[PDB]
A paper describes a structure:
Cutinase is an esterase that belongs to the α/β-hydrolase superfamily and primarily hydrolyzes cutin from plants. Unlike lipases, cutinases lack the active site-covering lid structure such that the substrate-binding cleft is exposed and directly accessible from bulk solution. In addition, the substrate-binding site is more expansive in cutinases compared to esterases, benefiting the binding of bulkier macromolecules. In this work, we investigate the PBAT hydrolysis potency of cutinases and PET-degrading enzymes, and find that cutinases outcompete other reported enzymes.
Residue numbers in the entry: 41 to 301
Write the structure that this text describes.
Amino acid sequence: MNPYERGPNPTDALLEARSGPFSVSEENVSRLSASGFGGGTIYYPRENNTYGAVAISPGYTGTEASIAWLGERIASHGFVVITIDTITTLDQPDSRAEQLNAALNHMINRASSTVRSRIDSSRLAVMGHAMGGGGSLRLASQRPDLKAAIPLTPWHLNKNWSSVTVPTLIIGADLDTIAPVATSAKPIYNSLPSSISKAYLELDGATHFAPNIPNKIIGKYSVAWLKRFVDNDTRYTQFLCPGPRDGLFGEVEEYRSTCPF
């Protein structure tokens, strides 16, 4: 009934594991094979199907290494993910939004036949850490044809993103001092239209750099979000709605959404 559904029926354990159910391979993208971004790496399911595609930017001073685990982990759940370097490491969010776009177009039009044939180019999503997350918001603002956006501990000069209609999961870190949620993640989140699918997830005991190491909360709810909105996969709705618990036994500091989806 839903032709975009991929992989087995999800469970907490399956979404929390270090790798998802899809066996993945890599395609190196060097700086000078890449037009409009700094190169990177494509992770793609070996299983010959079509999948949605994700571009992931790092933040200020950061490299591909800072986000690599997340691209691989997400690809292992049924997506073609590019994890990029930026033209320079000090690039600002709007240029990073352009690079996420250049990275999406590389995967669709420029990569090998192996990668291009595995992409449903109509079902695309962007993610970014920090300034990379502001990049995600800007491109989402400019490309309402995108299916999902996941800004991680995001920063942008502008926090008013009421122009975004792309389903957005804002992830914050409670101990973040580089992009405090008081001044960034939360103002950003509340700006997004109450009429779109959106969620706000704040990690507990998390610094700005929590997204830069394997984190099973980030991995779980990123995959759940991309599944629901890139694949329209309603098997994943129950993970987002009502969504993660706070408190002593729960897995998060705070969670808000526009559930039900």
